[model samples]
Target: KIKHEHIRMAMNAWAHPDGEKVPAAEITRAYFELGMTFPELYDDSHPEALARNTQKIFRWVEKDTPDAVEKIQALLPAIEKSMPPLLVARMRSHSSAYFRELVETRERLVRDADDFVAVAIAGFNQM
Candidate 1:
């Protein structure tokens, strides 16, 4: 059974500016993978258990801590630019649905969250 802290650790990992307690990229990978592997994070496909776990993360990201946006913003572009679309399609064709799902969930580019509302608005309300 997936625990809440497990979900929180995954979310908090990406919430860092530096690879402080956890590296942002690793977190991103975990999240991206989590979204793909679990299927509950997406509005489209969500297993009950995984979806609930995913909601916890959405709550965390919604937390509008100072520098939270900036920290996440910094990590996004590299991930976006680094992706090989051809490789992605190829992987999808040959990989498991879970693997394909991960690739599908990734934003083509990490949209800059500078002055993001999640920080100012809700804050980490991950229940």
Candidate 2:
């Protein structure tokens, strides 16, 4: 099936953000494709499990350590800025559903927590 190509293309796109291939354009492409190929992280498409997923991420961020997503927080603001409309909208819905989860969830954006919150709030305001 072409499913493997879907994932492999995402992998290839992911590797381009660094070194000479570096550009915010590539950064934007990677996340847009990632949203399409990764099935789901927060699984915002479904309601039943989304709360648990959000909570789980919160718990991780609440700990005195970084979660997997936080590793890229430094770059996320720029990424989000260019991250494509649908992906931003994806986060927007959750932000509207529960402001706290959105706060805690996007708060995991990194040690530069304030910046992430600002972008997330901006995205929320868009919808």
Candidate 3:
């Protein structure tokens, strides 16, 4: 069971604008590995519990894999560029479903950094 923050971190690691040097499918595999390694973050049934656990993973990735954060940040423009008006509208109108899309999208890249912003959006909302 992959947590949201892991999806966030993995997306950043794999979706840099240098043209997805790391494939999203591979990133999904990496996510599963991390999920297995950190099972304690599983079972977050409440929003608050998920939030706390998510931030813990965020900090862990930030400290341990700063490159990922930098890569995702570097690709912000590409992300914005890839997001169509309709998708943006859909995201705003159906936030929960959009969140689900973001989670699923993390497993594969539809457009380089497009899905990356979903993670970033979720991060901001969580904050």
**Candidate with better lDDT, 1 vs 3:** 3
Candidates ranked, most accurate by lDDT first? 3, 2, 1
Q: Highest lDDT among the candidates is held by which one?
A: 3
Give candidate 3's error at residue 36 in angstroms.
4.4
Q: How does each model score on TM-score? A: 0.20, 0.26, 0.24
The stretch of ten residues in a row with the least summed lDDT in candidate 3 is 19-28
**Model 3 superposed RMSD (Cα):** 18.0
Off by over 4 Å in 3: 1-10, 13-39, 45-47, 65-127
Q: Clash number for every model?
A: 5, 0, 0
What digit string (tens of lDDT, one per residue) describes model 2 on residues 58-120? 333234344433433433443445533434434444435554455556556664678878899
Better of 1 and 2 by lDDT: 2
User: Each candidate: RMSD to true structure?
Assistant: 18.9, 19.0, 18.0
Computed on alpha carbons, the lDDT of every model, listed in order, comes to 0.40, 0.42, 0.44
Candidate 3 C-alpha lDDT tens digits along 1-127: 2233443444454445533323332322344444433323433355565445445444444553665455444433333334333333333334366656664565456555767878889989997
Weakest ten-residue segment in model 1 by summed lDDT: 1-10
lDDT of 3 at 26: 34
